[PDB]
Amino acid sequence: TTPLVHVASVEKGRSYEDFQKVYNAIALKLREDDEYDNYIGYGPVLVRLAWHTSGTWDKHDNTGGSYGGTYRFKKEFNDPSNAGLQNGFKFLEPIHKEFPWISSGDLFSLGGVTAVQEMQGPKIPWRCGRVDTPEDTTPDNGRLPDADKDADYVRTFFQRLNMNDREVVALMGAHTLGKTHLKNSGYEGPWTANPNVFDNSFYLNLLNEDWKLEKNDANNEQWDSKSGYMMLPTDYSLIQDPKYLSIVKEYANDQDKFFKDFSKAFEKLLENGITFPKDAPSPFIFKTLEEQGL
């Protein structure tokens, strides 16, 4: 079928103030529900939700992507690749109830932006305008990446999302957040010692830890360190490939550079497939609760 064009349409009469309010609601709940996942909080799962709802995009026909907010439909909601994301969706339920006017796509993506910023990460400019699309526009399962692959697979996989080497290495740095859960993906363990703090620890660990290729309780191979950290085969491929390695070293040695590059790649990821009219509002940069004294 001919590729569709998805034009961003601002929720009727809404402006920066309105979205900052939604951001605040999300941030406030992130602070309140701090016991989730052994006190890691919902930050990490919200970031993964934003990425998986956007990561289904295919640059070839513009199917998938964050625009439609199709994760709300069972086919995508039940994608094996999305196991565990139901927690993020349930967290956003009360937020959507309070602000019913925001589209699902805008909420899913904004949830990721809010989480990164509240966890001390870089500011991520965000644009509104995603519009809910019918259940038949839901992309089939299988568009998200496997974790038992190598550098070549990763590089090729991300080309479908129009991401180059630097963009891929920066985006993978999101693994500085949260952990793998055996019951969700067949992998177990955190990548870092501070799962709810967005920093460049992912890269430093990859380079400085002594990794051992072991098999977890699900009979899958993953790299483990005596410090209690782990890396998926796809994470470890970043130091096996010489081109990826150079970039990992760059980020491990420049926190600001990683922040700037992640911010750009993450916004790009969340905006793939969306056409923003020339007269659309400029991207919003939300203040954190801390900056607002809230």
Ligand code: HEM
């Ligand atoms: C080759 C690409 C990638 C693969 C194979 C991959 C794989 C995985 C796996 C297996 C998990 C564990 C899920 C669980 O058991 O709960 C996970 C978690 C996560 N991923 Fe990735 N991922 C990739 C890229 C990314 C990117 C690009 C982002 C975002 C920019 C990201 C953000 C996250 C976050 C924040 C978590 C933690 C979720 C939580 O703690 O609940 N991932 N990923």
Ligand SMILES: [K+]
């Ligand atoms: K971290």
